[PDB]
Ligand binder design. Sequence first.
Ligand SMILES: CC(C)C(=O)c1ccc(OCc2ccc(-c3ccc(S(=O)(=O)N[C@@H](C(=O)O)C(C)C)cc3)cc2)cc1
Ligand SMILES: [Ca+2]
Ligand SMILES: [Ca+2]
Ligand SMILES: [Ca+2]
Ligand SMILES: [Zn+2]
Length: 291
Amino acid sequence: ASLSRFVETLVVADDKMAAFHGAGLKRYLLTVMAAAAKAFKHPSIRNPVSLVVTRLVILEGPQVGPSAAQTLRSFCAWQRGLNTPEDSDPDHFDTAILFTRQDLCGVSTCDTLGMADVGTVCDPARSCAIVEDDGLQSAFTAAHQLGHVFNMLHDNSKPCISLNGPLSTSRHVMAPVMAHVDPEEPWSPCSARFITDFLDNGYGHCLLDKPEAPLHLPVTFPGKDYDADRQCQLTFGPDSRHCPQLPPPCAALWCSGHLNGHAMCQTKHSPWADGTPCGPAQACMGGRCLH
Ligand SMILES: CC(C)C(=O)c1ccc(OCc2ccc(-c3ccc(S(=O)(=O)N[C@@H](C(=O)O)C(C)C)cc3)cc2)cc1
Ligand SMILES: [Ca+2]
Ligand SMILES: [Ca+2]
Ligand SMILES: [Ca+2]
Ligand SMILES: [Zn+2]
């Protein structure tokens, strides 16, 4: 029997998150975590994993700069101070994730969206992730980052090529770059095998207890909590509205912006959030306008 697992999570938001989101931050973080939690409940992962928020902190803490490698190391040694000796104590957490509006930047480019060391979930000193918040898509960056935390590699790594098969495209969470993920199958057979093996070898021992009193994650669709306009505001800023699009609805969110004193449209190529209205009795699901 495949034992159910609970990831008791500390959600930390920073200096820059608070300025951007203001009063709307706590609700926003929960919407994001609700989505991350949903990716992990998908049968593709072939394991029962409940991503549960037990503590949420809004910020004197970690050093947050452009270097992603540096910000991660800082947050990981900081987080450790908020932890507790035993997992009996309702204040203990199994994983820590920081969210920042800071443009996190790797060794070559700034396209980096987050960072985590691989296979650390039950090491309270290493169980760590940082995420660059560029709107609701950050839920996806989070799911990916926790993927790493759960010992998964990218889908183009040598071991994955073998398990994924010669026909595997980049439509999965553990793609090396941001990808449109298969709603029918978010996790590659590689991802499922790596987490499976990771848990069967006892590296998830800290995940067996059920959380004392978890924060209440919303049940609604992200595209209902936040309409197209709010989603544009979340990615590009408060003055940004949805750009009316000719019909490929749901596939890509296009937003307004201002360059030289006239309007223009802008995109990070991310889909409209799940549940966003796209017609009379229709909403976006996985990049498609369904009934
Ligand atoms: C809708 C449902 C299926 C779901 O909730 C869902 C879940 C996840 C998802 O997105 C997939 C996804 C998300 C993020 C990434 C991704 C890709 C690259 C990077 S990165 O920062 O450039 N690389 C870092 C990394 O590999 O983690 C390096 C720098 C350490 C960071 C994140 C790659 C794929 C999309 C949807
Ligand atoms: Ca506990
Ligand atoms: Ca970046
Ligand atoms: Ca636990
Ligand atoms: Zn990665």
